[PDB]
Design a protein around this ligand. Structure first.
Ligand SMILES: NCc1c[nH]c2nc(N)[nH]c(=O)c12
Ligand SMILES: NCc1c[nH]c2nc(N)[nH]c(=O)c12
Lengths: 254, 258
């Protein structure tokens, strides 16, 4: 099967946001950064081309794009001849923007651009090394109740323990300014996502809205980077004060 | 549920090797390097642990391990408490060696070991940049016929254009590095040959062996190494290494698409 933009499946963002009981206007801004590790097509002469794509979808887009459908859409490029790399990037912008409902940004880079590019970790302190027992993996947001009692602080915390539903795996970076967060509670909360079902996008939005309503920080940023499924990974960034992360560099599991 | 070694499914190497007309005594030595990006389990206290696994399976093993079973087997660790990372590494070795049929080597690394680790590309000259037309995608090994007419040389070549499917599937993507000492290979022929794999259905390990045996039969190098690095599926990638003279690749460093 060749190029087929109708393979893309929009999912209205409002659908699962309704269950976060949001306000009229969004409490956050941000974007979903997708890495397309498998991007490949044929040039005009039938010679395969390979590239890595990077896509940025604004969090204000009416829809997100269902990842399997994104994967299938990309696969439809595989056996398709395009006259150039510019054409490929342009069609990607067109189709993805059409689907999302807002202009999407797309970078199509040759593999060579990645040579020597670092695997990175996240900012701040990892909260994952704690001596605690967890017997119960059921999602409990109330785990955050009275979570930030501390001194007013600006800090960045991260965790590699985000898991969801076969399993999805992710790391999450939480930067905030407010009463200092209890690290055990935060860890327990994050771990409680383990058995639970939502899109990565929806999960980041849940974590943001839960932290905001329980811990009431002055400013908050929640940024997760998930390992790829079907050659694509999703990296939702949601912030009270900030538009996007500085770069797309991959983490160890990605 | 809980840790379950029975999920592992071996696939005998003999299947494809018979297909490639090999005897019990192999033209090559080597191993299959797997990277396990998703390895996770619970510590004794129920706190999730995450690691990247690195598994080397000797090419002399009776069996390979079917990737999906391997993934499912690994998932069974997710909700299981293990006493230590040491116990995890031990269980992996024991179970994977039993499935493969020979002692497998396993390294379980913390995520932190990868910080600042650079992405690498393969060695030598990329053959991918050629202005040529591909008329059809059917696998053709005869594309290598008369492919090394050149003066005697030692060189390393690579291509990012390896693609494959399998009956069990969704395309697989890979890069392949070929180092040889022999009559110099025509790069157009080699590139075409590799591209002709696009619609091919076989496992990564089988592909690499096919490429090695094809190059050996058609190009008759004095020594040959074929090393492919494939993108992951289900959290696992396979990097088969096959050489006349060498037992293993120098490292597991990941490539752009991996
Ligand atoms: N992770 C499950 C999943 C399936 N399809 C998806 N599409 C998007 N955009 N995000 C997701 O998290 C998923
Ligand atoms: N990629 C196809 C595939 C499915 N299962 C597999 N198991 C192994 N060992 N190798 C493979 O290439 C595959």
């Amino acid at each position: 099967n060749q190029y087929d933009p109708s393979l893309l499946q929009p999912v209205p963002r409002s659908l699962n946001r309704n269950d976060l009981h949001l306000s009229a206007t969004l409490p956050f801004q941000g974007c979903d950064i997708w890495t397309l590790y498998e991007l490949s097509w044929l040039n005009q002469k039938g010679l395969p081309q390979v590239a890595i794509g990077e896509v940025s979808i604004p969090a204000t887009s009416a829809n997100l794009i269902e990842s399997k459908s994104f994967k299938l859409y990309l696969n439809s490029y595989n056996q398709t001849r395009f006259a150039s790399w510019d054409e490929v990037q342009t069609r990607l912008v067109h189709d993805l923007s059409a689907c999302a409902g807002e202009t999407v940004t797309v970078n199509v880079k040759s593999l060579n651009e990645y040579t020597a590019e670092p695997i990175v970790t996240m900012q701040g302190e990892c909260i994952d090394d704690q001596d605690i027992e967890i017997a119960n993996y059921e999602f409990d947001d109330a785990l955050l109740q009275g979570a930030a009692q501390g001194e007013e602080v600006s800090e960045v915390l991260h965790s590699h323990l985000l898991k969801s539903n076969q399993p999805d795996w992710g790391s999450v970076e939480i930067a905030y300014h407010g009463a200092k967060m209890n690290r055990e509670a935060l860890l327990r909360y994050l771990v409680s996502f383990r058995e639970h079902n939502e899109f990565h996008e929806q999960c980041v939005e849940r974590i943001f809205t839960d932290i905001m309503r329980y811990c009431q920080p002055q400013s908050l940023t929640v940024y997760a980077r998930y390992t790829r499924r079907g050659g694509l990974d999703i990296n939702p960034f949601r912030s009270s004060h900030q538009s996007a992360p500085n770069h797309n560099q991959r983490m160890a599991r990605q």
